Amino acid sequence: NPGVINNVLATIGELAQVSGLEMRKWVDELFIIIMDMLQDSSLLAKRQVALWTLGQLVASTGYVVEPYRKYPTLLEVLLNFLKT
Amino acid sequence: EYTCMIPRDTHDGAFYRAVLALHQDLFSLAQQCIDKARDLLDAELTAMAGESYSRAYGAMVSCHMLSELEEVIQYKLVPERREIIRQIWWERLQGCQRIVEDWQKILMVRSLVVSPHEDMRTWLKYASLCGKSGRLALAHKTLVLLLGVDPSRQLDHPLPTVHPQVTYAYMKNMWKSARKIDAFQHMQHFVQTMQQQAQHAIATEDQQHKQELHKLMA
Ligand SMILES: O=P(O)(O)O[C@H]1[C@H](OP(=O)(O)O)[C@@H](OP(=O)(O)O)[C@H](OP(=O)(O)O)[C@@H](OP(=O)(O)O)[C@H]1OP(=O)(O)O
Numbered sequence: 001n002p003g004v005i006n007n008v009l010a011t012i013g014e015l016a017q018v019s020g021l022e023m024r025k026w027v028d029e030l031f032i033i034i035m036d037m038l039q040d041s042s043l044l045a046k047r048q049v050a051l052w053t054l055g056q057l058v059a060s061t062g063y064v065v066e067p068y069r070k071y072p073t074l075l076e077v078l079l080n081f082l083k084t
Numbered sequence: 085e086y087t088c089m090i091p092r093d094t095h096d097g098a099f100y101r102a103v104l105a106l107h108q109d110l111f112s113l114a115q116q117c118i119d120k121a122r123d124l125l126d127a128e129l130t131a132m133a134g135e136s137y138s139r140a141y142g143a144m145v146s147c148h149m150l151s152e153l154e155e156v157i158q159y160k161l162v163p164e165r166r167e168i169i170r171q172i173w174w175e176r177l178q179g180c181q182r183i184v185e186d187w188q189k190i191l192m193v194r195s196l197v198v199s200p201h202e203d204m205r206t207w208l209k210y211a212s213l214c215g216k217s218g219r220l221a222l223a224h225k226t227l228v229l230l231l232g233v234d235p236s237r238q239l240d241h242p243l244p245t246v247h248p249q250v251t252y253a254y255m256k257n258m259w260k261s262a263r264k265i266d267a268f269q270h271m272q273h274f275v276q277t278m279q280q281q282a283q284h285a286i287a288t289e290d291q292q293h294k295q296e297l298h299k300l301m302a
């Protein structure tokens with residue numbers, strides 16, 4: 001069930017909001033995981049919670065422009081959610 | 085008094101009402117106005133983003149400016165995150181398109197809590213951008229505001245040696261715009277009174293100042 005995934009995403013977003021700049025050593029793997037759960041969604045999982053916790057670990061760590069080139073498909077999949 | 089007549093159903097109305105409510109410490113109304121402006125802008129964003137990204141940048145800059153108001157809330161709420169958001173602001177401003185028209189409004193929504201005398205690393209770049217874009221009369225105003233005293237009124241008094249980056253940029257602007265002779269003597273005097281300064285600075289621990297002064301002298 002996706003309940004465990006939603007729960008761990010919500011708690012990890014709350015944790016990233018609690019501890020800022022002490023999670024920069026983890027944001028890369030979190031990005032690689034959460035973009036593969038957001039984009040190329042093989043299942044109909046909750047995308048709003050993933051989007052929220054993704055936006056929550058970039059306002060605390062300060063990952064502003066680097067992910068736009070480290071993951072060249074981030075802007076396109078962020079823009080598609082307005083038409084899908 | 086002016087915002088009371090702006091329509092409440094448009095994006096600019098919600099944006100300005102959020103800014104006004106934020107000015108008087110209303111952290112609950114401002115969030116609601118921000119969340120309303122979010123969708124009021126998302127409408128035209130998804131209407132315009134279907135063509136191209138370069139066409140939707142005009143709404144993306146506004147969405148970015150709107151998403152920087154929550155960081156103003158965090159600035160006025162938690163004193164421990166002030167320097168961190170003040171640094172991510174500078175890190176995020178380096179990604180936008182170098183145009184004075186949007187830089188002005190971004191810095192205005194940003195200076196709601198940060199005076200120009202508190203983060204001048206981002207205002208010197210703004211002055212240089214205004215100088216390169218042919219708008220030298222705005223670069224002069226920005227440099228004068230950063231300095232604190234307008235040297236164009238006292239043609240005989242020297243330039244304020246404090247804030248060395250600001251006076252260096254001011255001398256560059258004076259050389260570029262109008263006068264190629266006065267800026268030369270000004271730079272000579274500045275180099276003299278700046279080299280006569282590092283001698284009395286025997287720094288044993290703070291080594292983040294001597295190297296910067298040496299680079300500036302170079
Ligand atoms: O445009 P220039 O008159 O040639 O001056 C440049 C310019 O800085 P300014 O325009 O603010 O003076 C560079 O920055 P950009 O505008 O080109 O991005 C800056 O390099 P930085 O980006 O690292 O600040 C460089 O400094 P440097 O010579 O160390 O490369 C500096 O040259 P000068 O200060 O010597 O004029």
